[PDB]
Amino acid sequence: ALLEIIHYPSKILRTISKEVVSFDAKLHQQLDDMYETMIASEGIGLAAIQVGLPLRMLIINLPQEDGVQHKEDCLEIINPKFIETGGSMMYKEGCLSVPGFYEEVERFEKVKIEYQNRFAEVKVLEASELLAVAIQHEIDHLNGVLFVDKLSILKRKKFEKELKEL
Numbered sequence: 001a002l003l004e005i006i007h008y009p010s011k012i013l014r015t016i017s018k019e020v021v022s023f024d025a026k027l028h029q030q031l032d033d034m035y036e037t038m039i040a041s042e043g044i045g046l047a048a049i050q051v052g053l054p055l056r057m058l059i060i061n062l063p064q065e066d067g068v069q070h071k072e073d074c075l076e077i078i079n080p081k082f083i084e085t086g087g088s089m090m091y092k093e094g095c096l097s098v099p100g101f102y103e104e105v106e107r108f109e110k111v112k113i114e115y116q117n118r119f120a121e122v123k124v125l126e127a128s129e130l131l132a133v134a135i136q137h138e139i140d141h142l143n144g145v146l147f148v149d150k151l152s153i154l155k156r157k158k159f160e161k162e163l164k165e166l
């Protein structure tokens, strides 16, 4: 089923999500509704609070060569934790909770994370480029952080302008 996506400046997006403790059928349906909702709004990443669920879980499905998304590659990360981070780069980002606005944000260019899949299985994942960015972006949601929060002083004004523009 489709879920309503929460948009800035909703204070719900400032929520600190909680660890998932029960990996049951209820949790799996939520993840399924999140995937259906993400694809429907044509997103590549989605965190639980973006649909009102204060749980520390998020999904990521980057499009491949053909430029299309294949559910086969969808990542479901729960209770993520950074093991290591390195480098720095500027990446223009977007967000389903902040539709119509895109801006460069500084991110680690490489990250290694630890999490669990929907079956509570522990996983370790190293990532760079787009995948590393999506991971950092989505995890920020779990801590109530939006990418517009990380904008430089100048690009911050650009947001307020384009915001009053809509």
Ligand SMILES: O=C(/C=C/c1ccc(O)c(O)c1)NCCc1ccc(O)cc1
Residues within 6 Å of the ligand: 041, 042, 043, 044, 045, 046, 091, 092, 093, 094, 095, 096, 098, 099, 100, 101, 130, 133, 134, 137, 138
């Ligand atoms: O999926 C999205 C955004 C979707 C979107 C769709 C329609 C719009 O009009 C819009 O403003 C945003 N973001 C996933 C997280 C993410 C952001 C930046 C990036 O480089 C990697 C990952």
Ligand SMILES: [Co+2]
Residues within 6 Å of the ligand: 045, 094, 095, 096, 097, 137, 138, 141
């Ligand atoms: Co987002």
